[PDB]
mmCIF file of C-alpha atoms and ligand atoms in Angstrom:
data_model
loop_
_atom_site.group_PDB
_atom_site.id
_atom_site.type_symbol
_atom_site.label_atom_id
_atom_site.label_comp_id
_atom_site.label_asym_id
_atom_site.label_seq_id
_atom_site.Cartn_x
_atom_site.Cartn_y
_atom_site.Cartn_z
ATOM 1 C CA UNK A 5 92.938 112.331 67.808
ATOM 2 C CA UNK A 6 95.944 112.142 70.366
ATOM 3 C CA UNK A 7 94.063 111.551 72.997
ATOM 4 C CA UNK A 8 95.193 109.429 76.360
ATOM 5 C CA UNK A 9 92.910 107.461 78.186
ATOM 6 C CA UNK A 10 92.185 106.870 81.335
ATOM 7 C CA UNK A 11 91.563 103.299 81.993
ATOM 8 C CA UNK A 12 89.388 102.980 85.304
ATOM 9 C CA UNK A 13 87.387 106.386 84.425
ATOM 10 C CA UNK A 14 84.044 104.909 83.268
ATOM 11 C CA UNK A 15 84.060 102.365 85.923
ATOM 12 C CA UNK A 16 85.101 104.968 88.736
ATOM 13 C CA UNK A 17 82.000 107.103 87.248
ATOM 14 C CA UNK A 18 79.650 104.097 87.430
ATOM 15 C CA UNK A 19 80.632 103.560 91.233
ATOM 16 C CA UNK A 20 80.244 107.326 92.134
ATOM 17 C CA UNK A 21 76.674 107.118 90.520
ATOM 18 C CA UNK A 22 76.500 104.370 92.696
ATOM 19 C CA UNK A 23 77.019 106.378 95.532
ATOM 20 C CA UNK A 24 74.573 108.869 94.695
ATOM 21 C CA UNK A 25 71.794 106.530 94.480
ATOM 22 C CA UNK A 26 72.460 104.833 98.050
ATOM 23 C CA UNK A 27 72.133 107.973 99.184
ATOM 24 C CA UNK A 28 69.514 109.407 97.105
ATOM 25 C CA UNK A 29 71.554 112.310 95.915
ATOM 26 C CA UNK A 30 70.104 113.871 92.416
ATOM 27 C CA UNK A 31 67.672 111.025 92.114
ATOM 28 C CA UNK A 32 64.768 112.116 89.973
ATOM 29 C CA UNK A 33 62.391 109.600 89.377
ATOM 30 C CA UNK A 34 60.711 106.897 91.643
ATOM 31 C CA UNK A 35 60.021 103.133 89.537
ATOM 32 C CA UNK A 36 57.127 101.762 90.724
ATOM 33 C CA UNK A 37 56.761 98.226 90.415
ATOM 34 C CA UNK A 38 53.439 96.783 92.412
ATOM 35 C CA UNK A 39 53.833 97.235 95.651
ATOM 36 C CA UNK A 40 57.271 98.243 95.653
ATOM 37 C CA UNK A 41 59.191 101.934 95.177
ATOM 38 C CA UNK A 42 63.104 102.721 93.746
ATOM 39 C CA UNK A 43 64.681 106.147 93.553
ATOM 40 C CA UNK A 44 66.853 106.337 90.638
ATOM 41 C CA UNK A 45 68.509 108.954 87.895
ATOM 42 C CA UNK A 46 66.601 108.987 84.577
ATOM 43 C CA UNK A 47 69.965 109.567 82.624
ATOM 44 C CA UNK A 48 71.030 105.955 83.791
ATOM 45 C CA UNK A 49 68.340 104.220 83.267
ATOM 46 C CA UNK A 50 67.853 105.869 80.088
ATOM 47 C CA UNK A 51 71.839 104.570 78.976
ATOM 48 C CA UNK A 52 70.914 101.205 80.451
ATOM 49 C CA UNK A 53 67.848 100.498 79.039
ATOM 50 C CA UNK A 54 65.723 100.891 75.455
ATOM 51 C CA UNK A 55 62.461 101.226 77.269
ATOM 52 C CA UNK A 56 63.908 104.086 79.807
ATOM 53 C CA UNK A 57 65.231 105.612 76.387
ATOM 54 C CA UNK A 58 62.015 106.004 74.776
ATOM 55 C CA UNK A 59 60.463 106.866 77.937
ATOM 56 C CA UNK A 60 62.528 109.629 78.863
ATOM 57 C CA UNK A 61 62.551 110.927 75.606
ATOM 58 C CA UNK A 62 59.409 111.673 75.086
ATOM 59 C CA UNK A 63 58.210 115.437 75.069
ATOM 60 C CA UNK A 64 55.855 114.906 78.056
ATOM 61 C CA UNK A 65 57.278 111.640 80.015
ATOM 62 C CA UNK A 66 60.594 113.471 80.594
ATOM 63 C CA UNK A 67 58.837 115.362 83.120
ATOM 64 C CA UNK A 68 57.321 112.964 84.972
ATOM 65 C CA UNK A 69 58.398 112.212 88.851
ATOM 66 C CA UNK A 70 56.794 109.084 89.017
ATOM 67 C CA UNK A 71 56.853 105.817 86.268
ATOM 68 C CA UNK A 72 54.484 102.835 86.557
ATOM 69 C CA UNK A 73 55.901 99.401 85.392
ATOM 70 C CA UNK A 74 53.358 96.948 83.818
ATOM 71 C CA UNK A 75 51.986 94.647 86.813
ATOM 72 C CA UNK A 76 53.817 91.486 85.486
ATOM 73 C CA UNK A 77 57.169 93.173 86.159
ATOM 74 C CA UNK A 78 58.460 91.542 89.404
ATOM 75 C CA UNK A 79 59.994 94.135 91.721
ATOM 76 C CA UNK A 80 62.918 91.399 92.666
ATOM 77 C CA UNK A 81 63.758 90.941 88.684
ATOM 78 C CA UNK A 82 63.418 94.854 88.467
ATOM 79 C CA UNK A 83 65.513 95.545 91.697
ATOM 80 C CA UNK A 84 68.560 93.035 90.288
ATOM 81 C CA UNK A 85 68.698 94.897 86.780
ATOM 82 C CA UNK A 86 68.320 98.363 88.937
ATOM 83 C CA UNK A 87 71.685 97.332 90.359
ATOM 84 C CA UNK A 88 72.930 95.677 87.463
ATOM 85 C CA UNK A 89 72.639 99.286 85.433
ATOM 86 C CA UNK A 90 74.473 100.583 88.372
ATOM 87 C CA UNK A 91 76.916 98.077 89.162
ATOM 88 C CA UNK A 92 77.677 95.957 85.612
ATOM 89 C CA UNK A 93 77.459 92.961 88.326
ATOM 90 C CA UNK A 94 74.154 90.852 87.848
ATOM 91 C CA UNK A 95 73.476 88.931 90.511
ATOM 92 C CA UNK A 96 71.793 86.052 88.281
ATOM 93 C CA UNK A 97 70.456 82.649 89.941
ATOM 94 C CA UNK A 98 67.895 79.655 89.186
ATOM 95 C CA UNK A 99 65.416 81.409 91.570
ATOM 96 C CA UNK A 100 65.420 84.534 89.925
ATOM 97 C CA UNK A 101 66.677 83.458 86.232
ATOM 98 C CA UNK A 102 62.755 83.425 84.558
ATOM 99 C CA UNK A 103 61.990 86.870 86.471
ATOM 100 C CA UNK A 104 65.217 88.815 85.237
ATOM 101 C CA UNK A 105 64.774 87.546 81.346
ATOM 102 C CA UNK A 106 61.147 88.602 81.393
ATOM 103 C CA UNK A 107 62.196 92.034 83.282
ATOM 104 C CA UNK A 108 65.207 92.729 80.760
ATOM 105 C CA UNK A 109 62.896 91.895 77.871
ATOM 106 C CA UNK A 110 60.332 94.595 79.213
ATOM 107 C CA UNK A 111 63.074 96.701 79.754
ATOM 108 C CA UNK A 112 65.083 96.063 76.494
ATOM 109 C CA UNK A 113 68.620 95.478 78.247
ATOM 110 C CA UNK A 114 69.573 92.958 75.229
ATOM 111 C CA UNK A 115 73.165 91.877 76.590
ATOM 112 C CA UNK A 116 71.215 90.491 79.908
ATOM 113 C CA UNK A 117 68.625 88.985 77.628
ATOM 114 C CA UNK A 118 71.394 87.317 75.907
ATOM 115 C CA UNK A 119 73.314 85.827 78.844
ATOM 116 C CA UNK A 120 69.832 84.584 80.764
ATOM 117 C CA UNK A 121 68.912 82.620 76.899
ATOM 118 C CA UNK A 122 72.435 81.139 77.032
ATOM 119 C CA UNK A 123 72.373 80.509 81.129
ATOM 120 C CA UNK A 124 68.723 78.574 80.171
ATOM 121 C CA UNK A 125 69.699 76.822 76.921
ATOM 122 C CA UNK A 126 72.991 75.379 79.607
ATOM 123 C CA UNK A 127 70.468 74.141 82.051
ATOM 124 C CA UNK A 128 67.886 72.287 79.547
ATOM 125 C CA UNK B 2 96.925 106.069 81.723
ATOM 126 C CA UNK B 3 96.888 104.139 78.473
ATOM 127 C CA UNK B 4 97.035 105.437 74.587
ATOM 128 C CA UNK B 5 94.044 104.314 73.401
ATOM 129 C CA UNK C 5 78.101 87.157 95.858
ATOM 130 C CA UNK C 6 77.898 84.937 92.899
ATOM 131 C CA UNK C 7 77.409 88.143 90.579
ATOM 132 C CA UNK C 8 78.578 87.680 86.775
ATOM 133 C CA UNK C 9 79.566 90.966 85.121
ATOM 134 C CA UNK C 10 79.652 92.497 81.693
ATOM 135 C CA UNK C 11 83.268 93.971 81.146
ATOM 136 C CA UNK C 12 81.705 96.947 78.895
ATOM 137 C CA UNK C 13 78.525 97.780 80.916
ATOM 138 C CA UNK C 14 80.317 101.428 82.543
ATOM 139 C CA UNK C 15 82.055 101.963 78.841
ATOM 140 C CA UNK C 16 78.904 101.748 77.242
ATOM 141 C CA UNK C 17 76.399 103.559 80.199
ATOM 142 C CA UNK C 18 79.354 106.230 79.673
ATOM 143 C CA UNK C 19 79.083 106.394 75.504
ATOM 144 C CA UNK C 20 75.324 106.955 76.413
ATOM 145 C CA UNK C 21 75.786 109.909 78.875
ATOM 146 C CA UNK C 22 78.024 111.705 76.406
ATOM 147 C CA UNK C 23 75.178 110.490 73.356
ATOM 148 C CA UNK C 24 72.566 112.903 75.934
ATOM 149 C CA UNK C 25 74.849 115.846 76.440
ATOM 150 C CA UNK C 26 75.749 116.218 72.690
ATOM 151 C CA UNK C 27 72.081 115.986 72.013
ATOM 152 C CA UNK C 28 71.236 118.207 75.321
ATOM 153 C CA UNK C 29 69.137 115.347 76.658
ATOM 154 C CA UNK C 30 68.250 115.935 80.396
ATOM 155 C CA UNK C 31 70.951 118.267 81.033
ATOM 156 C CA UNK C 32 70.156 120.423 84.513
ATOM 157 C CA UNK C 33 73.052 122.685 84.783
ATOM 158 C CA UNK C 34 75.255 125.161 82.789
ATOM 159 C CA UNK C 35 79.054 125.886 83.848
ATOM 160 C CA UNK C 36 79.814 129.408 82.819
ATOM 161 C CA UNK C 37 83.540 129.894 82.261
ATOM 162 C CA UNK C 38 84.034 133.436 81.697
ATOM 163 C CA UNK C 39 82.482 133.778 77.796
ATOM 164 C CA UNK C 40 81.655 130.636 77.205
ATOM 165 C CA UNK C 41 78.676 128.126 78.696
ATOM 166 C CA UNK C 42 78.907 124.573 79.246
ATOM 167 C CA UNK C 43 75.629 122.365 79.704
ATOM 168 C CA UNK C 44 75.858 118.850 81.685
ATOM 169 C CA UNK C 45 74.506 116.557 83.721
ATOM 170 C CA UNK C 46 75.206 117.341 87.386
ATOM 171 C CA UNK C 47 75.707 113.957 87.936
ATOM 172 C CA UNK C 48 78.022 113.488 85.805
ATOM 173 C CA UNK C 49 80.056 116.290 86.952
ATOM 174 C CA UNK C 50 79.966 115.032 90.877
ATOM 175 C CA UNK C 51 80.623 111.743 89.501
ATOM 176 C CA UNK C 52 84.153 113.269 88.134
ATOM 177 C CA UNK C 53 85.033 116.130 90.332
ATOM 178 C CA UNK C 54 85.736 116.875 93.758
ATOM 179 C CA UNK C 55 85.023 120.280 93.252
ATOM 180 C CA UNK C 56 81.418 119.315 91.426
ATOM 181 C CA UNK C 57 80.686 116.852 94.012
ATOM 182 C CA UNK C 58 80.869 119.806 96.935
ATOM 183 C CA UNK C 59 78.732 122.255 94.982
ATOM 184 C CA UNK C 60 76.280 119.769 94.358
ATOM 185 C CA UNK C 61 75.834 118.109 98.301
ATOM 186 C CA UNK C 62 75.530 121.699 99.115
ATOM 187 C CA UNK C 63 71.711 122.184 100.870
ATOM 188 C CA UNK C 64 71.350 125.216 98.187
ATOM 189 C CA UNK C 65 73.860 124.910 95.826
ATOM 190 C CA UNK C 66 72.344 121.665 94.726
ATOM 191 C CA UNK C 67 69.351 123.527 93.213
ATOM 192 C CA UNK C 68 70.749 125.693 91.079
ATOM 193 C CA UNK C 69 70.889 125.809 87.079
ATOM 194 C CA UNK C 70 74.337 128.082 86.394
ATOM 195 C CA UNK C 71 77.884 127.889 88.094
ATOM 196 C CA UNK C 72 79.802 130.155 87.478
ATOM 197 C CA UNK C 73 83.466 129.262 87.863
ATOM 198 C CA UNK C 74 86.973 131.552 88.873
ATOM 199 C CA UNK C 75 87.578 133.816 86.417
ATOM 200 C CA UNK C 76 91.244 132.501 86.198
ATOM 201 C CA UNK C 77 89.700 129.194 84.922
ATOM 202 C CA UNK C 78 90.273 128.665 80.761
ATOM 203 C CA UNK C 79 87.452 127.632 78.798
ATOM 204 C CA UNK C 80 89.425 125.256 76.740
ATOM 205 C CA UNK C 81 91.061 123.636 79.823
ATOM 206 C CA UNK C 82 87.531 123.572 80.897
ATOM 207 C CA UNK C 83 86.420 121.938 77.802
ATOM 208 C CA UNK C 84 89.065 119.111 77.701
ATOM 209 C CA UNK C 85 88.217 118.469 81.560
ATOM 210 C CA UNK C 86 84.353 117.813 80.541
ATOM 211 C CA UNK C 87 85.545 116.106 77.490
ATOM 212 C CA UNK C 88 86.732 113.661 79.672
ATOM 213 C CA UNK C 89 84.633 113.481 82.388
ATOM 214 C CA UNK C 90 82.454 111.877 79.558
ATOM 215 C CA UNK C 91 84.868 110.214 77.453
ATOM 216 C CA UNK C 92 87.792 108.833 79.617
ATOM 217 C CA UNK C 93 89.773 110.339 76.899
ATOM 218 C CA UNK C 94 91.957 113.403 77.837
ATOM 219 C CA UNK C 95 93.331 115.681 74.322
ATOM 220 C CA UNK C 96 96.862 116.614 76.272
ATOM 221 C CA UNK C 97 98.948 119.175 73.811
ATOM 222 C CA UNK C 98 101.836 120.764 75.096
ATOM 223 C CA UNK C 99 100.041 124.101 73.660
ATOM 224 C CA UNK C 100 97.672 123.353 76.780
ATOM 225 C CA UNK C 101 99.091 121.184 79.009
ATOM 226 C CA UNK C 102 100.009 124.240 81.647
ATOM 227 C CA UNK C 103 95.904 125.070 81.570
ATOM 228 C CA UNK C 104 94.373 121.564 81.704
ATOM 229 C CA UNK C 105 96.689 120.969 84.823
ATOM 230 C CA UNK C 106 95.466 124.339 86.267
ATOM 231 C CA UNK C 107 91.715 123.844 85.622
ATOM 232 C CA UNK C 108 91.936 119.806 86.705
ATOM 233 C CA UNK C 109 93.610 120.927 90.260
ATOM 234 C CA UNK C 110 90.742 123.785 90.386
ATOM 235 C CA UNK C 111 88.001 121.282 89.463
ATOM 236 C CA UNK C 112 89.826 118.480 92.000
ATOM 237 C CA UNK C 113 90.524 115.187 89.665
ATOM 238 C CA UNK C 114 93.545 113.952 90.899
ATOM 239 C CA UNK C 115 94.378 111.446 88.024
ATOM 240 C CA UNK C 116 94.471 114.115 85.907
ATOM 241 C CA UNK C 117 96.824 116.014 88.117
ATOM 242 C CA UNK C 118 99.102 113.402 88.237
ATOM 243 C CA UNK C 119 99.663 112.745 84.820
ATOM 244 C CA UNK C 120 99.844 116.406 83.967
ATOM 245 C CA UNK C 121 102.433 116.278 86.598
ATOM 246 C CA UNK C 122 104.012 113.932 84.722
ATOM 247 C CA UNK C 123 104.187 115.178 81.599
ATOM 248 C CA UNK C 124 105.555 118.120 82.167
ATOM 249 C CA UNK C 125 108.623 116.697 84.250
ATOM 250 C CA UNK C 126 109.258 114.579 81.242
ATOM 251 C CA UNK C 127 109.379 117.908 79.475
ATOM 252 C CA UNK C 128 112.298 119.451 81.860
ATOM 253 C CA UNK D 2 80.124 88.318 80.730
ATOM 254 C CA UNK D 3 83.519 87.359 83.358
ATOM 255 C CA UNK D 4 83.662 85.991 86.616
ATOM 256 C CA UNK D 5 84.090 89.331 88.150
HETATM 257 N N1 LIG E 1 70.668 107.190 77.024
HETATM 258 C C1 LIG E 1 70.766 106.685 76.004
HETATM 259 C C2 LIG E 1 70.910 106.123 74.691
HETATM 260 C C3 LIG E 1 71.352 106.863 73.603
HETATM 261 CL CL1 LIG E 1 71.624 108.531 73.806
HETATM 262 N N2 LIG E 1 71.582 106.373 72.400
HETATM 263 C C4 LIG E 1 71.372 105.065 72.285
HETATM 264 N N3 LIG E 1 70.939 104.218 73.221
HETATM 265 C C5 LIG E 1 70.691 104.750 74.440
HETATM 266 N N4 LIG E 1 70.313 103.910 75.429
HETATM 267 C C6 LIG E 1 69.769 102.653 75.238
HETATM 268 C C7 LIG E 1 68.958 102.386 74.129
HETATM 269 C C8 LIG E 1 68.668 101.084 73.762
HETATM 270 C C9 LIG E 1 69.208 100.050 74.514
HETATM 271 C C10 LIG E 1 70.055 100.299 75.589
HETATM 272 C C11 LIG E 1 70.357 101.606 75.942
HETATM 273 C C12 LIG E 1 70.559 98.983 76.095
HETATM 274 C C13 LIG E 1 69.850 97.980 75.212
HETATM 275 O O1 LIG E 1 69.960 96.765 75.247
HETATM 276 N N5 LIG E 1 69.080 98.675 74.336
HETATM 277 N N1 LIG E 2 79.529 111.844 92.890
HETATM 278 C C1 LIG E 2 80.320 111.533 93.654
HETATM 279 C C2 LIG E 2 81.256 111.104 94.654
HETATM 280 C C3 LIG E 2 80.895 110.290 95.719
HETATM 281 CL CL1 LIG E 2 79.255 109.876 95.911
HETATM 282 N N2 LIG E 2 81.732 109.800 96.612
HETATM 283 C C4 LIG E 2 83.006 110.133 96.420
HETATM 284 N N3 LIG E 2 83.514 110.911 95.462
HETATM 285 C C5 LIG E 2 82.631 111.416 94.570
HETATM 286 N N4 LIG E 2 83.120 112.154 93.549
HETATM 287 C C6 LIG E 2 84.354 112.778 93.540
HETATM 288 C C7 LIG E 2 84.911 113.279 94.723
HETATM 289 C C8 LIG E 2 86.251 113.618 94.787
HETATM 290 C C9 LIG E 2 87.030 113.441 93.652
HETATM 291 C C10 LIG E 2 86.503 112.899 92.484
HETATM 292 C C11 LIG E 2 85.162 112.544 92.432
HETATM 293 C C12 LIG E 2 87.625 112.723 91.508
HETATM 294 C C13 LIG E 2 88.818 113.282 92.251
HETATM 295 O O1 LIG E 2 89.970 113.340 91.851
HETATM 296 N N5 LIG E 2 88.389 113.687 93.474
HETATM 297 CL CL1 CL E 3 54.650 112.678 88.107
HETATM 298 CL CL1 CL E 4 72.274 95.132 78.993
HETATM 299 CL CL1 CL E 5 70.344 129.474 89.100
HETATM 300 CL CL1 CL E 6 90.489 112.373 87.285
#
């Protein structure tokens, strides 16, 4: 086509989503991970994430208000890749490295898979 | 504004 | 922070959004525009529009499932608009320049505006 | 991935 495009669009999107979810406007679904609750939009995680894809897909989880996360998931490793989906910043450390690969595995994010292998494999 |  | 980022995380989460409303995947709302109906994500369109974003904080507004926009709105200026909103890509032709200017002041997306505006004064 |  002859389309123009708009440079900052996708990342002034991201932000307003942003927005919305700091102040729970439109959020639809509540994570639960252990002891610990986040109010999201399916549609994000579902663009973020493989496992939020299938989930949401699916004829009778699309309706659900509530999601359970297996009880290894740690709610810190869940609440940086939360913001990550969010913000495309990931606030990855040595504390928190182990806990965000296992919790992007789970959640089939394969980019932050990638730079937590690579972060490791600099480290050993 | 960019052509893409 | 110490954050790293991934340059085409909001690209990408965008590509996904637009992947759900072609497939009518979560969709909550449909913008009438005279004879023609418009399903999206109302998140999406808040995200986008300053217009959107009012309708949408509105304590009843929020909850409904059609909008029905002025009937001096085009549906083809209204098409390119969403278009965009999920694309970053806007299809400007001088056959509709005059109505995608219209509709994007209506619908409140400045950038658009402005290089509408510009167009057109290259025109003259 | 950038230094953001
Ligand atoms: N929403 C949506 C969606 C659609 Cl519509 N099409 C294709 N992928 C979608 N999302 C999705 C699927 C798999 C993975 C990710 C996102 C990130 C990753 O590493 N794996
Ligand atoms: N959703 C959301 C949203 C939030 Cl949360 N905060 C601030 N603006 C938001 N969206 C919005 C408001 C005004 C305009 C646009 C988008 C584009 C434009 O030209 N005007
Ligand atoms: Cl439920
Ligand atoms: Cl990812
Ligand atoms: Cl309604
Ligand atoms: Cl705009």
């Amino acid at each position: 086509d002859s389309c123009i495009q708009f440079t900052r669009h996708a990342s002034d999107v991201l932000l307003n989503l942003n927005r919305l979810r700091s102040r729970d406007i439109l959020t639809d679904v509540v994570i639960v991970v252990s002891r610990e609750q986040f109010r999201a939009h399916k549609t994000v995680l579902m663009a973020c994430s493989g496992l939020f894809y299938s989930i949401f897909t699916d004829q009778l989880k699309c309706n659900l208000s509530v999601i359970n996360l297996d009880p290894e998931i740690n709610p810190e490793g869940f609440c940086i890749l939360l913001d990550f989906m969010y913000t495309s910043r990931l606030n990855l450390r040595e504390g928190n490295i182990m806990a965000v690969m296992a919790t992007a595995m789970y959640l089939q994010m394969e980019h932050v898979v990638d730079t937590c292998r690579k972060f490791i494999k600099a480290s050993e | 504004w960019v052509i893409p």
